[PDB]
Amino acid sequence: TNKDYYPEFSWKTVPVAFHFAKRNGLMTDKELDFVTSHSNFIVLEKGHGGDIRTEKGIDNEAQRIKDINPKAKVVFYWNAFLDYNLYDAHKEYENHKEWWLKKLDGNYDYKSAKVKRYDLSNPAFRKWWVSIAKKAVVDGHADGVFMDAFIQVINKGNIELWGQKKYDAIQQGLKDLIAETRAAIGEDHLIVYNGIRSIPNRNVGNDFPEHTDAVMIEHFANFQSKSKESMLQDILEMEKAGKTGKIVVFKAWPNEHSWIDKNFMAKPLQEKRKIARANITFPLAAFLAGAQENSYFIYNWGYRMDDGGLEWYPELDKSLGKPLNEMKVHNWELTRNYEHASVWLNLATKEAKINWK
């Protein structure tokens, strides 16, 4: 398959993407200018646009983005497992109790008070779920869909809640959901999925490669993936997925801080920014160690636009150029050479050096 419907990729500087929602309205002209001048790849999150609800917010923003930069690919976030009350589609799902997932005790399956989990083994739900993506992407200005939460679907804790037969049907239902999504949106639209997660003895890789174009590594060097074991596998998985022709979204964090780091989010923006600027080198070097064509670096502390989403860093303006070799692994040390940069990092010590040329 020809991949020209991918976002146009270049090694000229560090390839970056965006993944956020602006929670109270659409982007300003200058916010629009910043994003479109810095990347061709933007995932718009649940809740983007505010009260207009996500479908209209994302459809409107996608127009605004591609009016400025027709090369940008704007992806419609649509959780594969969770019912968030931020869409027009949520009102419809509330009217469809007959699809709702139930647990072994007969209670409806809720992740939290306001968030039901979907019965992926229910084909009536699936046809509806797919129709929402199809309307956003085929009949709207979005170029693709971001299927989130696969990790929570496959979680083996769910066997206790569903039983093995239902758990197996739901895992198969996730596979079919992706196939049906591809069927509905056609061959020229993107499917991004959130799945690579390295947790010791529990690794999840690029395990839904058929029908998908892009895979995200959400937890690099953070959450339960802080171990050198886990960061190595994450980086290796980027390399592997990239070599198969996938887009890889490598989501990085400022020294393990994030929007659920209450102490860090308490700091004033100037300090948050000082910390983020000081801590980009190790995740950036990890990214560059394993990056392939169509690999993208996302570095911020969350998924709101204000979560560092429009911050910029000098490292992201320097000349990089094409990779000159494959990643090299010497125990916990990883190296890579580019036309205008040499990358080295030590996963055991969390130290990194980028020699920009």
Specify the CATH number for the domain of residue 278: 3.20.20.70
Please say whether the beta carbons of 214 and 249 come within 8 A: yes
Give the residues across from 322 on adjacent strands: none
The 3-class SS string of the chain reads CCCCCCCCCCCCCCCECEEEECCCCCCCHHHHHHHHHHCCEEEECCCCCHHHCHHHHHHHHHHHHHHHCCCCEEEEEEECCEECCCCHHHHHHHCCHHHCCECCCCCECEEECCEEECCCCCHHHHHHHHHHHHHHHCCCCCCEEEEECHHHHHCCCHHHHHCHHHHHHHHHHHHHHHHHHHHHHCCCCEEEEEEEECCCCCCECCCCCCCCCEEEECCCCCCCCCCHHHHHHHHHHHHHHHHCCCEEEEEECCCCCCCCCHHHHHCCHHHHHHHHHHCCHHHHHHHHHHCCCCEEEEECCCCECCCCCCCCCHHHCCCCCCECCCCEEECCEEEEEECCEEEEEECCCCEEEEEEC
Q: Is residue 77, in this structure, part of any structural domain at all?
A: yes
Query: Quick one: which of 195, 93, 188, 212 has its CA closest to 137?
Result: 188
Q: Is residue 178, in this structure, part of any structural domain at all?
A: yes
Query: Quick one: which of 319, 324, 326 has its CA closest to 340?
Result: 319
Q: Is residue 96, in this structure, part of any structural domain at all?
A: yes
What is the tally of structural domains in the chain? 1
Please say whether the beta carbons of 59 and 136 come within 8 A: yes
Please say whether the beta carbons of 308 and 302 come within 8 A: yes
Q: Is residue 167, in this structure, part of any structural domain at all?
A: yes
Q: Domain limits at 53?
A: 18-322
Q: Is residue 11, in this structure, part of any structural domain at all?
A: no
Q: Phi, psi at residue 136, to the nearest 5°?
A: -65, -40
Q: Is residue 334, in this structure, part of any structural domain at all?
A: no
Q: What amino acid occupies position 132?
A: I
Task: Please report, for residues 64, 101, 187, 221, the alpha-carbon distance to residue 9 in angstroms, rounded to integers and kept in the order given.
Answer: 21, 40, 19, 25
Please say whether the beta carbons of 142 and 136 come within 8 A: yes
Q: Is residue 1, in this structure, part of any structural domain at all?
A: no
Query: Quick one: which of 40, 303, 35 has its CA closest to 148?
Result: 303
**What's the CA gap between 303 and 289, in Å, rounded?**
25
